[PDB]
Amino acid sequence: GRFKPLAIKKKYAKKLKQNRPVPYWIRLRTGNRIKWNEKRRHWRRTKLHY
Template identity: 65%
Template structure:
């Protein structure tokens, strides 16, 4: 292992503890940034995003059965990176 420090903790353990603390700080900073973004978004924008998220799904299988497989897929399906919503 590593050399012992004065307080009896190994070097490796000390480094791992230090890395864990840094990771925790980065995570909390990221969460804080997300909260700020979330709080600054208006309710109307959130409603539009929620509606777009609900609409962006494949068609149910029972619709394929009911229509005799004439409707096979959702023509209005949207990829989050390729097509923008336009907010």
């Protein structure tokens, strides 16, 4: 609903902008290991219960 302490909004805000595909250019670095983001989250699956 509407209610959120801003501290919770800052955290969902945190996880929200953290919920992004890895940059394309990061995969092109030497010795790179990363491909997909292993910490992609989906609201319908993992829950950030705050």
